Amino acid sequence: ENSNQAFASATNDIDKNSHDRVDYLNDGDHSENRRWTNWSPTPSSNPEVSAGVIFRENGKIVERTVAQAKLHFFADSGTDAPSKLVLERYVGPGFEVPTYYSNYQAYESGHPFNNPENWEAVPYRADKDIAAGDEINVTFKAVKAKAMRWRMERKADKSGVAMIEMTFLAPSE
Ligand SMILES: [Ca+2]
């Protein structure tokens, strides 16, 4: 499509039996049955997974100013909200949307998204506990970026992170 593009370091969308999709992160829909997850039957010992949005309009990547975010997590037997949550803004070189935008780590490791030095932490405040259920609202000092992400860690007793929606928004006003 020609609008914002959701992306993730990893996604459970490889197995033909899976219905998880990274594109469900920014579709406006809050159905529990349309989620992104990085669930695996054999999870990595590194609990980290990142998911984010590349800002686009009329098919071209654009810079936006953002100061607010929304997060909607999901949980079930395998997945949950994360134990740790870092907001980051892209500060790397110019880029295009990854071909493997749901699995850049495994399938497009040369993409600049895969280099941690291309992401800068953004301090933030959330309105409630980081848990599955209600939408969580987040504020931060306004930054300019072409892409934002959340660098997350799964819980130790879970096999992945699950999300129903992720949004970034312009400052108040
Ligand atoms: Ca959604």
Numbering used by the authors: 1826 to 1998
What did the paper state?
BgaA is specific for galactose β-1,4-linked to glucose or GlcNAc [lactose or N-acetyllactosamine (LacNAc) motifs, respectively] found in glycoconjugates. The N-terminal region of BgaA comprising amino acid residues 138–993 has amino acid sequence identity with GH family 2 enzymes. Further analyses also revealed the presence of non-catalytic CBMs within the C-terminal region of BgaA that mediate adherence to host cell surface LacNAc and/or lactose.
The two predicted CBMs were recombinantly produced and the polypeptides screened for binding to all commonly occurring monosaccharides by UV difference spectroscopy; only D-galactose gave a signature UV difference spectrum consistent with sugar binding. A single bound metal ion was modeled as Ca2+ on the basis of coordination geometry and B-factor analysis. Tryptophan 1514 lies directly beneath the glycoside bond and coplanar with the disaccharide thus providing CH-π interactions with both pyranose rings and a higher affinity for β-linked disaccharides than for galactose alone. This binding site architecture accommodates lactose and LacNAc, but would limit the recognition of other sugars terminating in β-linked galactose.
